[PDB]
Write a protein that binds this ligand. Structure first.
Ligand SMILES: COc1ncc(Nc2ncc([C@@H](C)N3CCN(S(C)(=O)=O)CC3)cc2-c2nc(C)nc(N)n2)cc1F
Length: 840
């Protein structure tokens, strides 16, 4: 009974009932649940309860040069508090927490004031992110003396060979049936491995009535022994002049290596090119409205495995050197395959090589597995995330290839997993089976670390709530996570979900009262409902989903309001529930219903990756990739950046509601907000840096052409773009006269700052180009897994151009500087055209 009481709880947290079997035709999901018990238990049993409880967040990356020149001679100050009054201590960057706490005593723990963050463990204090964060923002390091939190609070509650068959594969299409609906229609059946169609066959076209039967056998040209694991039977329905209307898939070799035998009635998905959704094995849960198809397959199990010319070498290195979106010809494929063993010596050749394997040919695949047996150089090579990500995309449906990718991820430190976690979670969509090396890796790295675990929960939950194609798989994975994270995390997750459920309701009802124009009489209505839920049943405190170290407390009803938008998001502000906080600042969260926030998360995360890339080359570009977390179906939270205003408003306040935009206004605003000329120029510099990073970052992603109401700036000079969910003469990015004036330029001039801006942009751009392959992959995956409305080849090939693939550096500078100049030329014309468009 209580075990079922625990399952009800799990289900509430996941947002999907995992025990259900109403939408399966096999036991793969249930088999995967039993399969993940072991790796879960293993990781739960092997994790240090102490370090797990305090989750020290640390890095082994070198302290960047920009954070070095902010330390006054190998010394940092660490203010230690107790009851109220605060003693200060001098420390060197290399002092371990215990060493600093030993210095003080002439057992307790150092906790960061206001946060559930801890400076504990065998690493120097220059190696904690909270310290580097305090350094970057020119801030002081305040910590309390505290008891370690009890590990009892994290306690988890204990608990015929296929290769002897030369028969061609065939499938019987009995017919299709739609419940509701004059043209004709046919069924197309594809044997696929990844994006490759191995063999294709159609039925003959019949009239599209609410029931169409065929009773036809489609013999394929492929032999049953030649079926590779992860082969999908992809059934599609066309009509006409031709158009695809429905699709469904079925793994031909199941999870227990058995060939698929018997009667199936598969409920299909509708269409609204390369969408991750097209690859799913999930059938449509909506039995009542959806099309279905009926088929027949006729105990076969699949067995398991055990000096060139100059011209050709060059030709092979030319191929190996190309980008991931450069299509390989048959000549190139045949070359790579013929020179198999020479290509294996180059890690960079792996994606291309494994794309040259004829996967519908049992002996070739065998030789490929032989080849994978001899992977000494790969195993030895340093971790290349870009290369590793390529092997986890839609082009690779073979487990053994994919496993060598995950093999390399094992060596990622917890800092790096957090950088790539979102996209690793999305790559699960390209896995043929519910149980995968990648799925388990995410499981153990999550269970090993509360911060990875926190974000894994939300990322998974976000997909479970707004994707029917993959919710089943992600629900199995998240169930496995929650069954080992511990009772404390379970309580946190419960609190967080409760709060966001309470806020959703208040949002839906507020949206209903308004005419889409936001009256202040409605802002009284909002304040009423917020007060109503404050006493009961809102919880005393909750972790901020996008910043888990922070606990939000009581609402500041006074400061909450309904924002002037057509989605009417809630601007909310909370007090911090932690009294040891030594600030008054509220915690600002925008709560929005109406849009899928996943796209936003993806761009923001790519921005974080771009930052770290730049850190490798000691460049800081002061981007503000603010917190943004999808929390359920078309709902989520966004962090409110403090002391921030839009560029639009700075114009509107001086100039008025008119497009008569003025060059001087921003610099004036910055001058007025800067109290001192030293703080001013620092703000101006921050702006030159910020502006350069957003110019480069948005060019590469093709999101630089924006209305300046979607660009903001802080009172300390920090420019940042907002609201990426959305997405004539154009512009590569936003570099307007107001920005140029702040730098000391107008019309056709240059300055001390402007040349430095051009300097930073060029070095920023080139630095990204040193990771072309990585960025191309994240961009392809982003499109394929997060943006259904923008997934053609030509959409993906934007980034090839943007990154000037194949060109030398010195030319690529010339390319970027032209873009800077294509802005100069246009001044206000596009911003002005944005005013005409959006305001009217
Ligand atoms: C993905 O959806 C969103 N993404 C980002 C934001 N953030 C912001 N959106 C709009 C604004 C400006 C234009 N806003 C207009 C309305 N007024 S009002 C009179 O309704 O209160 C407030 C200012 C600002 C933000 C924003 N975003 C962040 C991250 N920080 C700050 N400070 N602001 C809001 C979203 F709904």
């Amino acid at each position: 009974e209580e075990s079922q009481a625990f399952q009800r709880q799990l289900t509430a947290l996941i947002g999907y009932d995992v025990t259900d079997v109403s939408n399966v035709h096999d036991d793969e999901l249930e088999f995967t649940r039993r399969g993940l018990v072991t790796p879960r238990m293993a990781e739960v049993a092997s994790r240090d309860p102490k370090l797990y409880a305090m989750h020290p967040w640390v890095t082994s990356k070198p302290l960047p040069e920009y954070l070095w020149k902010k330390i006054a001679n190998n010394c940092i100050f660490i203010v230690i508090h107790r009851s109220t009054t605060s003693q200060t201590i001098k420390v060197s960057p290399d002092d371990t927490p215990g060493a600093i706490l030993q210095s003080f005593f002439t057992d307790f723990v150092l906790r960061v004031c206001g946060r559930d963050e801890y400076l504990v463990g065998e690493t120097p204090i220059k190696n904690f992110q909270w310290v580097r964060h305090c350094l970057k923002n020119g801030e002081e390091i305040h910590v309390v003396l505290d008891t370690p939190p009890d590990p009892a609070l994290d306690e988890v509650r204990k608990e015929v060979s296929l290769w002897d068959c030369d028969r061609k594969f065939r499938v019987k299409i009995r017919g299709i049936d739609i419940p509701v609906l004059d043209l004709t229609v046919f069924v197309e059946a594809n044997i696929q491995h990844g994006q490759q169609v191995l063999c294709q066959r159609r039925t003959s076209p019949k009239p599209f009535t609410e029931e169409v039967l065929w009773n036809v056998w489609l013999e394929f040209s492929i032999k049953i022994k030649d079926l590779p694991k992860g082969a999908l039977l992809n059934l599609q329905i066309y009509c006409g002049k031709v158009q695809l209307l429905y699709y469904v898939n079925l793994l031909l070799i199941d999870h227990r290596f058995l060939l698929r035998r018997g009667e199936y009635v598969l409920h299909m998905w509708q269409i609204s090119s390369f969408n991750a959704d097209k690859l799913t094995s999930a059938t449509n849960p909506d039995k009542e409205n959806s099309m279905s198809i009926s088929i027949l397959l006729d105990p076969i199990a699949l067995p398991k495995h055990q000096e060139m010319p100059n011209q050709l070498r060059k030709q092979l290195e030319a191929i190996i050197a190309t980008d991931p979106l450069n299509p390989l010809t048959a000549e190139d494929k045949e070359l790579l395959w013929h020179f198999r063993y020479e290509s294996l010596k180059h890690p960079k050749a792996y994606p291309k090589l494994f794309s040259s394997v004829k996967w519908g040919q049992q002996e070739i695949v065998a030789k490929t597995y032989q080849l994978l047996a001899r992977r000494e150089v790969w195993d030895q090579s340093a971790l290349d995330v870009g290369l590793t990500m390529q092997l986890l995309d839609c082009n690779f449906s073979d487990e053994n290839v994919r496993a060598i990718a995950v093999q390399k991820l094992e060596s990622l430190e917890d800092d790096d997993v957090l950088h790539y976690l979102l996209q690793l979670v999305q790559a699960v969509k390209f896995e043929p089976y519910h149980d995968s090396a990648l799925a388990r890796f995410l499981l153990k790295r999550g269970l090993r670390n509360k911060r990875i675990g926190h974000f894994l929960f939300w990322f998974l939950r976000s997909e479970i709530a707004q994707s029917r194609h993959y919710q089943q798989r992600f629900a199995v994975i998240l169930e496995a996570y929650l069954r080992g994270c511990g009772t404390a995390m379970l309580h946190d997750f419960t609190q967080q979900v409760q709060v966001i459920e309470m806020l959703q309701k208040v949002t839906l009802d507020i949206k209903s009262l308004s005419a889409e124009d936001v009256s202040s009489q409605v802002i009284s209505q909002l304040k009423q409902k917020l007060e109503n839920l404050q006493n009961s049943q809102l919880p005393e405190s909750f972790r901020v989903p996008y910043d888990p170290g922070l606990k939000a407390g009581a609402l500041a009803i006074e400061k909450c309001k309904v924002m002037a938008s057509k989605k009417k998001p809630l601007w909310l502000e909370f007090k911090c529930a932690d009294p040891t906080a030594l600030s008054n600042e509220t915690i600002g969260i925008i709560f929005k219903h109406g849009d899928d926030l996943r796209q936003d998360m993806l761009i923001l995360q790519i921005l974080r990756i771009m930052e770290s890339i730049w850190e490798t080359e000691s460049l800081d570009l002061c981007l503000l990739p603010y917190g943004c977390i999808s929390t359920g179906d078309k709902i989520g939270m966004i962090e409110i950046v403090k002391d921030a205003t839009t560029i639009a408003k700075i114009q509107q306040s001086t100039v008025g509601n008119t497009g008569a935009f003025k060059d001087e206004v921003l610099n004036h605003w910055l001058k007025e907000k800067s109290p001192t000329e030293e703080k001013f120029q620092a703000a101006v510099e921050r702006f030159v840096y910020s502006c350069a990073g957003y110019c480069v970052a948005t060019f590469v992603l093709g999101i630089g052409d924006r209305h300046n109401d979607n660009i903001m700036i802080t009172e300390t000079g920090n420019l940042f773009h907002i609201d990426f969910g959305h997405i004539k003469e154009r512009v590569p990015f936003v570099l307007t006269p107001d920005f140029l004036f702040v730098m000391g330029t107008s019309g056709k001039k240059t300055s001390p700052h402007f040349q430095k801006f051009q300097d930073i942009c060029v070095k920023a751009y080139l630095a990204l180009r040193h990771h072309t392959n990585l960025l191309i992959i994240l961009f392809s995956m982003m499109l394929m897994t997060g943006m259904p409305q923008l997934t053609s080849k030509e959409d993906i090939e934007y980034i090839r151009d943007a990154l000037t693939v194949g060109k030398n550096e010195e030319d690529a500078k010339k390319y970027f500087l032209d873009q800077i100049e294509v802005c100069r030329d246009k001044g206000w014309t596009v911003q002005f055209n944005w005013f005409l468009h959006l305001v009217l």
